């Protein structure tokens, strides 16, 4: 038990949040100040974004249960997994603006429910519209 | 010793001569030769080097770990170079070279003339810094140490000969 059971717990809520989430973006957050990361976290919360940094070994087994086993493939380097529940993309757009604003914040891989969108194709999810447009 | 577990990868253009404990390395930079300890067995594997302890030697792995570091330094010295930067701090200290001989004015009543060993070169881009180039890490380190020992840096004002990488811990005086 002890830290092992703590990992047992930790994997549970992230797996369930991945079940309950809509879109997924994992990015590199190296050389970023906490006072800059805290502003990123506030912005994400104001738009329904759950972003957590966990051990890559834990997160591979966390996302095995989740649909994006495609996303599981790379998982190299620091990883800030963001679950864009609510409107599908609020996380990707914020990660793009935070990249140009704060250098070293690398977007890296992201997930469009099954298809592995690279860093050169995040624009599709960055430019998606809101869900309530039938009116 | 698990430094000795890691193999040393010899690059291309470098030859390795092994005659038991005595080894020789030649590269684009120069030539080095070293007699290894009798308690270490070296093996030239497929374009790489491996080290191990011989049987019947208490030292064994420690000697092997030392041997690996020496051969790695030799490989680096024969492929790339080893460089040392010396900085002179003071009102009138200056240096110059005349062919493997550095003349120094270190606030003395006499000039200081240091004769380099065989495989060491010294250049002075300015009158306040010295660049030492060589292939033998130990030899170039010794030469830099001797140059520093000519006038070790001074704790109250840093005046002397220091390394560029070195940080000199200063001091203060209350003048009683």
């Amino acid at each position: 038990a002890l830290n092992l059971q703590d990992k047992q717990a930790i994997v549970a809520e992230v797996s369930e949040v991945a079940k309950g989430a809509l879109s997924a973006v994992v990015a590199d957050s190296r050389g970023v100040t906490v006072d800059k990361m805290t502003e990123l976290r506030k912005a994400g919360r104001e738009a329904g974004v759950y972003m957590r940094v966990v051990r890559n070994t834990l997160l591979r087994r966390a996302v095995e249960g989740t649909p994006f086993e495609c996303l599981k493939d790379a998982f190299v380097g620091p990883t800030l997994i963001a679950y864009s529940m609510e409107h599908p993309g609020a996380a990707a757009r914020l990660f793009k603006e935070f990249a140009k604003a704060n250098a070293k914040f690398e977007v890296k891989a992201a997930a469009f429910e099954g298809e592995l969108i690279p860093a050169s194709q995040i624009d599709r999810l960055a430019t998606l519209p809101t869900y309530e447009e039938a009116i | 010793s698990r430094v000795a577990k890691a193999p040393v990868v010899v690059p291309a253009g470098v030859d390795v001569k092994i005659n038991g404990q005595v080894i020789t390395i030649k590269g684009k930079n120069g030539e080095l030769t070293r007699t290894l300890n009798d308690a270490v067995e070296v093996k030239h594997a497929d374009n790489t080097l491996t080290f191990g302890p011989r049987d019947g030697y208490a030292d064994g792995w420690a000697q092997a770990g030392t041997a690996r570091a020496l051969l790695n330094s030799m490989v680096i010295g024969v492929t790339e170079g080893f460089t040392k930067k010396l900085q002179l701090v003071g009102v009138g200290y200056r240096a110059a070279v005349k062919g493997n001989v550095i003349n120094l004015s270190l606030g003395f009543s006499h000039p200081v003339d240091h004769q380099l060993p065989a495989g060491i070169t010294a250049e002075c881009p300015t009158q306040t810094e010295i660049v030492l180039k060589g292939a033998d890490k130990q030899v170039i380190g010794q030469v830099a140490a001797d140059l520093r020992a000519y006038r070790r840096p001074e704790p109250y004002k840093g005046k002397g000969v220091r390394y560029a990488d070195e940080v000199v811990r200063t001091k203060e005086a209350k003048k009683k």
Partner: protein, 134 residues
Amino acid sequence: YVKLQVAAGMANPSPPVGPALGQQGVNIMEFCKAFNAKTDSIEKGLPIPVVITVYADRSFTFVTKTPPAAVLLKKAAGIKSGSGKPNKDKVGKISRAQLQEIAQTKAADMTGADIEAMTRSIEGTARSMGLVVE
């Protein structure tokens, strides 16, 4: 590139103001009117932090911060001192109701998006300063 805590409506008197910008080499009058503008726009007579960030290229920038929680809570409790023995003396009474307005005041400073969390942080400070909270 410095910082300060000049009181509100007290930029004109230059006891440590003049020295500070004097060494930097900044004109007091220009900073004075500009700081005064905000210090008078708010409750005059209160230590207000200011991040005067003059760029060495003769720049002039300043970011006034919310007055510190220490002075806010001590004024709310009507006390001009602090608890010497926060566990024993514990003097000066406040109100949970009184924690909300100062929490709203300083919400621009903290990170948490929960007003109750803000009140729990400021009351954590209150227990340190030995204030009677109900």
